[PDB]
Structures are given as C-alpha cells and as structure tokens.
Ligand SMILES: Nc1ncnc2c1ncn2[C@@H]1O[C@H](COP(=O)(O)OP(=O)(O)CP(=O)(O)O)[C@@H](O)[C@H]1O
Ligand code: ALF
C-alpha cells in the first residue's frame with residue numbers, strides 16, 4: 006500500500022503499525038493478505054482458446070469462400086447429370102484449401118511462449134520474513150508475503166517484493182537491478198529518504214525492487230507493495246496486451262479483401278440486372294430450379310474467380326524463403342510477416358548496454374606520473390585496446406604499442422589492480438568465451454592486468470582456460486593478501502593489506518593497496534610515486550593529476566575513473582580494528598599516489614557503420630538507455646548519433662527531464678531527440694508510442710527485461726542473443742550472434758520482400774479480375790460456362806502459384822538502400838496501374854470466352870454451330886429455332902472448356918513475363934533472366950499437360966486438347982497479351998508521369 010521511498014524508516018514502520026524487531030501479527034497478515042491479496046503477477050491469461058481459429062474466419066478468404074463451399078455443397082447434392090460421380094469435389098476442395106490455409110495460421114501461433122511467464126522467473130519461490138509468532142526468521146512462500154512485514158535479504162537472494170530498506174546489516178549493500186535499469190553494475194543502497202515523489206528507480210537508492218538480486222550484503226526492510234503494484238508488476242502490465250497485432254503489410258491486405266468483397270456481392274447484383282429476364286420473357290416456366298442452379302453456379306464461380314486462393318501460400322513462402330535467408334545471418338525470425346516490416350521502418354530505437362555496446366567494462370585509458378620538478382608535472386598516459394573481458398588488446402603510448410613492464414609505474418598500477426580486487430576472469434568453455442566473476446568494474450581491472458602483463462610472463466602457449474587469470478596469478482604469488490578493508494560509502498574506497506611472499510630478510514615490505522573515488526583517495530595521498538621513487542605531493546602536482554581526471558571524466562570520453570595509491574608504511578596488523586569500517590578511512594592515509602584508470606562499457610565494433618548505413622537508407626537511430634546521461638551521450642558521439650563536437654542540449658533527455666515536458670513538448674521531443682538516458686522501462690514504450698503516433702514504423706532493439714515493453718510496442722522488436730530470455734520472448738527477431746550490422750541486412754531484406762510481394766500480387770490479381778471477366782460473358786451472353794471453379798482453383802492455386810513465387814526470386818532492386826522508407830499511407834494499386842491489369846485482365850477474360858466461342862461459331866473441327874443463337878441451350882429437345890436435331894447436348898462438351906482454360910494457362914505464362922517487371926519491357930530487358938521463372942513455367946505447363954493426358958484427372962477437368970487443333974489456336978489467342986502489356990508498358994516508359 007505504501008507510496009513512498011520519500012518517507013523515513015520510521016514513517017514506514019508507522020504506516021503499517023509494526024515493530025521492526027518483531028514483525029507482523031497473524032491478525033495483520035490476515036487483513037493485508039485480504040486487502041492486497043497475494044504477492045505475485047497473474048500469468049497472462051487475458052484471452053485464449055483451442056478455438057483460436059474460430060476468429061480467423063472474418064475476411065473474404067473465408068466468409069466469401071465459405072458460402073461458396075456450402076452454397077456449392079448443396080448444388081453438388083442435386084447433380085442429376087450422368088456425372089453423379091465427379092460431383093461434389095468443389096465443396097471439398099474449397100474446404101480442403103480453406104482448412105489448409107487456416108491450419109497454417111495456427112501451427113504458427115501455437116508457438117508463442119509468453120514474456121509474462123519468462124518474466125515470472127524473476128519471482129523467488131521463498132522469502133525470509135520476521136513475523137510476531139516467532140523469534141526466529143521464517144522462510145515462507147514469497148507469495149504469502151504482504152505489504153508491511155519485515156523482510157530479510159542477503160547475497161544471492163532475489164528480492165521478493167518492493168521493499169523500503171530499514172537496516173543494512175553489512176558494511177555495504179550492493180544490488181543488481183539490471184532487470185529495471187538494464188545495468189548489472191551494483192548500486193549501493195542506503196536508508197535515508199529519497200524525498201522526490203517523482204524520482205525514478207535509478208534515484209530510489211533506499212528501495213529494494215521485487216525481482217532484483219543482492220550482489221552482496223544483508224539487510225532488513227519492510228515490504229512496501231506486492232504483486233502487480235510493483236515495478237516489475239508494471240513491466241507485467243504492459244506485457245498483457247489484448248491489442249491484436251496489426252502488421253503494416255497485413256492491414257492493406259485486409260481492406261483489400263474488404264473492397265474486393267464489396268465488388269463480389271455487388272457484381273452478383275450486376276448479374277441480376279442483365280439476367281432476371283425470366284420475369285418478363287421466358288414464358289413463365291422453364292425448369293424453375295434452373296434459376297437457383299444458374300444464379301448459384303456462377304455466384305460461387307465469381308467467388309472463386311475473384312479471390313486469389315493461391316496468394317496466402319505464395320506469400321507465406323516468400324516470407325519463409327527470406328526467414329531462412331536471414332537465418333544464415335544468424336538473424337532468427339520468430340514471426341514470419343516481420344521480415345518485411347523491417348524494410349519500411351523509419352525509426353530504430355535502441356537499448357544501449359549490451360546492444361549498441363558489448364557490456365564489458367573496459368579500462369581504455371590510464372596514466373601515471375612521468376616527471377616532477379618544481380611547478381612542473383608531466384604524466385605518462387596510455388591507452389588500452391580491447392572492448393571485451395578477453396585478455397586480448399594491447400597497451401599503447403602515443404598510439405604506438407609498448408611493453409607495460411618497461412614502466413615501474415605500470416608495474417605498481419597492475420599490482421594494485423590485481424590485489425585490490427575481488428573479481429576474477431573465467432573462460433566458459435561451453436560458450437567458448439571469457440566471462441566475469443564479480444563486479445564488472447573490478448573484472449575490468451582483472452582483464453587490464455592480463456592485457457598489461459607487467460612481468461612479461463610467457464602466455465602464448467597457454468590454454469584459454471588457463472590464460473584467464475595467468476598474469477593476475479603471478480602478482481598474487483608475489484604479495485600475500487593478508488586481509489581486505491571493504492569499500493564503505495563514507496570513504497568511497499577500499500583496500501587490501503598485503504605481506505611479501507619471499508623475503509626472510511627482516512625487512513617487511515608490508516603494504517596496503519588502495520583504489521577508489523579519485524577525489525577521496527588523492528586527498529589522502531602525501532606522496533606521489535615516480536617510477537620507483539617517492540616524492541612529496543605538492544599542490545601543482547595534485548593539480549595536474551586532478552586536471553586530467555577532470556578531463557577523462559567528462560569529455561567525448563566520459564570515463565569511470567578510479568585512483569590507485571599505496572600506503573608504503575601501513576599500520577601494524579594487530580593495531581587495526583577490522584570490525585568497524587568507520588575506522589578504515591584513517592588506515593588509508595599517508596598514501597603514495599600511483600596512477601589512474603578510466604573505464605567504459607564500449608561500443609561493439611560494427612555499431613557505428615550500421616548507424617551510418619541506416620542513415621543512408623533514411624532510418625533514424627535513437628538511444629533509450631537506463632544508464633546515465635553523460636555515458637549515454639558519449640557513446641552516442643562514438644557511434645555517430647552525435648558529432649564529436651556537437652553540442653547536444655535539446656537532443657538528449659533523462660527520463661525525469663522528459664517527464665517535465667508538457668505532453669505536447671514530449672511528443673515533439675521524440676521527433677528531434679536521440680539519447681534518452683536514466684529512463685524507466687515505461688519510458689521506452691512511451692517513446693515508441695509517440696513515434697508511432699506520427700504514423701512512423703519503429704523498431705525497438707535491445708536485450709534487457711526493461712526493454713520488453715518497448716520490444717512489444719514497436720512494430721518490430723529485435724533481441725540480442727546474449728540478452729535476457731524475456732527480451733527474446735518479446736521480440737520477433739533475435740540476432741543470435743549479437744551482430745548489430747545484421748539489422749541493416751534485415752531491412753534490405755525487408756525492402757526486397759515487399760518489392761517482390763507487390764510484383765507477384767499484381768500478377769496474381771490480373772488473372773482474378775480476368776477470370777471474372779470470363780464468368781461475366783460466360784453468363785451475360787448466356788454462353789456455356791467457359792470455365793468451372795475446379796479449374797479456377799487449380800489455376801489460381803498452382804499454375805499461377807508457381808511463377809508467382811519465381812517472382813519472389815526476382816532480382817533485388819539494387820540501390821534499394823539508397824532510397825528512403827516507403828510511406829505507410831502508400832497505395833499499392835495506382836489510378837493507372839489499376840488501368841493496366843484491368844486492361845489486361847479484361848482482354849484475357851474475353852479471350853477464353855472467345856475460345857468457347859470458336860469451338861462452336863467457327864468450330865473448325867468438332868461440333869460447330871456458326872452464328873448460332875447460344876442464348877439458350879435447354880432448347881436441345883425442341884430443335885425449331887435451330888434445326889440440327891439429334892445433335893443434342895454438345896454444349897456440355899469437355900473440349901470447349903479445355904480451350905478456354907489452355908488459353909488461360911498460356912496467357913498466365915506470358916503475363917508472368919510482362920510481370921517479370923513493371924515498366925521494364927521485355928524489349929529492352931531480356932525475358933530470359935529468371936532461370937527460376939522459366940523453371941516454374943515449365944513446371945506449370947508440364948503440369949497442365951499432366952492435367953490433360955492423365956488418368957483420374959481430365960475427368961475432374963475436361964478432355965485432352967489435340968495438337969494441330971486445340972493448341973495452335975490456344976497459342977494464337979495468347980501471343981497478343983505480350984503486345985497488349987508491351988504497349989501499356991510503353992505508355993509508362995515513354996510518356997508516363999515518371
Ligand atoms: N569496491 C570499490 N572500490 C573502490 N571504489 C569504488 C568501489 N565501488 C565503487 N567505487 C567508487 O564509488 C564512487 C561512488 O559510488 P556510489 O555508488 O557510492 O554512488 P555515487 O556517489 O557514484 C552517485 P550515482 O550513483 O548517482 O552516480 C564511484 O566513483 C566509484 O568510482
Ligand atoms: F542496456 Al539499457 F537502457 F537497459 F542501455
């Protein structure tokens with residue numbers, strides 16, 4: 006219940022009315038557990054059902070094609086022709102193709118693993134409370150802890166609830182909140198009020214947050230809030246999102262099924278108009294059932310003529326093709342559609358630490374004293390290469406490589422670094438990589454001493470395992486670490502009391518080695534080491550030292566600095582009280598200053614250039630980090646988001662600063678700003694939202710649990726493979742190899758996928774609004790149905806279905822990444838591109854009804870009926886308007902239908918060559934490009950021939966077309982299609998808008 010880190014220990018103990026040393030009474034626990042319920046996040050239950058599919062039955066590629074499957078199932082129950090056997094295939098292929106596409110929707114969805122469940126792994130099973138019914142501490146179910154009870158935590162513990170700290174039993178309590186701030190560096194807590202009620206977690210140094218863990222120490226607190234009323238609870242709350250995914254491609258293809266569905270219902274009324282003559286002319290009586298059999302035969306034929314049944318499968322294979330192409334860049338795509346959505350992205354938001362940077366604390370600079378006399382102090386300054394905990398990198402003085410052992414200054418530097426140091430480097434043989442044991446900041450020094458190798462030890466021949474701590478080990482064989490004076494908040498340093506290992510001499514080289522806050526340590530330094538020599542700490546020396554420290558702590562190199570000193574004459578081991586850290590500062594006095602070191606969690610090698618390339622492709626990168634504004638900015642300058650001398654005011658905010666802007670100014674601030682620093686998880690998704698509120702496609706890239714809300718908001722969330730599992734779970738792509746330059750590759754991939762999707766979509770629709778043309782002359786002129794649905798499906802699904810996907814193999818438009826992101830308010834079909842495929846679709850429609858009308862009217866071979874009133878075909882019994890009796894029933898012939906269809910296949914093979922481009926003509930551009938499009942055309946017509954000259958088929962379709970007959974003309978009807986789209990192609994490529 007409590008709403009403050011801003012209250013005092015007392016006011017909080019007060020709020021819930023509880024003794025710090027006795028805890029809660031069973032009475033109170035009863036109440037609280039009643040008022041507040043249990044301490045746990047609910048498990049993303051929002052909505053679900055085996056039923057799922059029950060809702061993927063909305064669009065046209067359902068309802069429209071669902072009638073046509075029942076409307077076509079009733080009609081195929083009254084098929085009292087002589088083909089009662091080949092009857093109800095239509096009902097069953099409409100629904101087998103409907104059950105097919107639908108079941109891919111679900112084996113792709115029954116894959117999701119929830120972030121919320123990934124997130125609840127940060128929930129400790131047990132918690133330790135002090136309650137009233139016992140003197141002893143009580144391990145209880147962490148879910149059975151209520152706001153108010155006294156809680157105890159220690160090293161390794163996961164924090165159970167959100168807790169005000171009451172008492173720190175240790176000399177320092179170090180927490181890891183990378184869960185919330187995305188930095189694993191240990192924050193050092195305290196007890197004092199944090200009075201700002203608008204303080205962010207980074208500020209709330211007296212709180213323990215549920216889900217964080219104790220790096221080190223022991224502490225007593227009072228639970229302040231539990232369950233979903235916690236900071237992690239807020240992360241959980243923005244995970245649950247009933248808001249269904251509306252991908253940028255998918256939506257344009259959902260109101261196209263909406264506008265074509267209105268063309269459907271409304272061209273079934275456009276038939277009621279030319280037909281319906283039977284209320285005025287057909288003498289009131291002519292097989293009355295023939296009306297619902299005709300109106301419904303060509304109703305469920307306009308259904309299937311219009312819809313591209315093949316398209317789902319084609320598309321869902323253009324994606325899978327790219328998904329597997331991305332897989333080979335170690336970009337693991339999780340949601341198929343998202344491979345595209347990356348190309349149209351205009352903004353990329355990015356977590357800093359572990360994403361744009363390696364997240365390996367690196368000492369990149371260090372100095373020692375060089376020369377001192379009078380008013381003059383020169384330093385030796387170095388630089389150290391390496392952005393990783395691996396002992397790979399070299400120490401440079403003036404950009405040229407040196408040996409650190411050539412410098413007595415560095416020998417001591419290194420020593421202090423090895424000994425004043427609780428960390429340790431470990432080579433994980435499984436992951437195949439060096440990892441830290443300990444604080445990142447201390448582990449940085451470990452690695453520095455390895456890299457440095459001041460005793461010039463032979464290390465080349467060493468196993469990686471053994472190379473880990475090699476140089477460190479040398480130094481600690483030299484000096485026995487006697488005991489260690491732990492860091493305290495008072496003195497901002499720590500140190501180590503050390504004895505020599507070798508000397509029987511009666512001369513005690515006994516020594517304390519100190520590191521810490523540079524100001525603090527330099528004050529307690531009376532001397533300054535100059536190699537092997539010791540000289541007094543004058544004021545002009547202290548000034549030179551303190552000056553560079555000011556410089557390295559602030560520039561475009563904004564480093565974490567640390568001073569290193571030794572106490573040459575330490576106290577006597579038995580004069581020192583190691584129980585009371587308040588004493589330790591005084592033992593750490595009379596020091597000889599040794600040198601200084603600067604640290605960075607450095608950028609990944611390839612992040613800078615990826616950023617540069619993103620810029621060229623017209624994409625803007627934004628950093629949104631829970632780390633500090635100075636660090637954030639200096640990384641930005643290094644990866645090129647800012648200029649090395651750019652003045653950044655107004656282009657970088659902290660979470661706090663952002664919050665103080667009026668809501669309007671905030672939304673504008675996301676348009677111009679690039680670092681958002683010291684943010685909370687919810688800042689990241691607020692920002693992604695403002696961005697998207699300008700109808701911009703935004704990606705979020707990161708790796709932390711604090712990244713999750715924004716990984717979700719963003720159109721595309723992209724996780725790093727070394728990141729958290731929840732971040733992986735929340736995103737659609739994981740860069741397995743942490744290669745940040747693969748994101749650029751993924752956008753180029755997205756852009757090419759789109760280009761091709763639209764080129765193969767034009768191809769596929771032209772033969773839909775081109776079969777409907779044919780069903781509307783096969784009906785408006787009372788002609789005999791030139792095509793039946795079973796042929797339509799097969800064609801739309803397969804003959805077209807193949808070269809459709811060979812137009813996914815279409816050569817990637819080069820310079821694809823020299824232009825900007827397409828607009829989302831971009832139309833696919835244009836006022837004139839519609840005029841194109843409507844011009845063509847129109848042609849062929851006639852050309853196939855005009856091959857049903859050349860196996861009669863000019864029927865060179867079989868049953869010809871020249872200029873014959875094919876207004877009727879029921880007329881057969883009464884051969885009076887037309888003589889020719891005993892000829893009856895040639896209208897149901899297989900051959901007139903074989904011609905229409907083979908003309909359709911042949912024209913949808915030349916259309917697949919005009920759709921080998923857009924404006925690019927086959928005149929200038931060789932048709933013989935895609936060896937794959939050729940392969941698909943052969944396979945296409947090689948299957949049409951398996952659909953002619955084979956067993957069981959041709960029976961579901963129609964009788965074989967003979968050479969010298971139904972092919973010469975199937976080919977003579979086809980050719981012109983090229984010329985029609987080659988003149989329409991001139992229209993664009995000689996006098997078009999451009
Ligand atoms: N084990 C250790 N030995 C020596 N110095 C240490 C240390 N752990 C931390 N430091 C030093 O701690 C000094 C201050 O740490 P502290 O956590 O107390 O908070 P703070 O004063 O840095 C403010 P803030 O958290 O907002 O930046 C740092 O500059 C760091 O150099
Ligand atoms: F790694 Al972060 F904000 F969590 F940069």
Ligand SMILES: [K+]
Pocket residue numbers: 716717718719720721722735736737
């Ligand atoms: K997402």
Ligand SMILES: [Mg+2]
Pocket residue numbers: 187356357358359360707708709
């Ligand atoms: Mg991170």
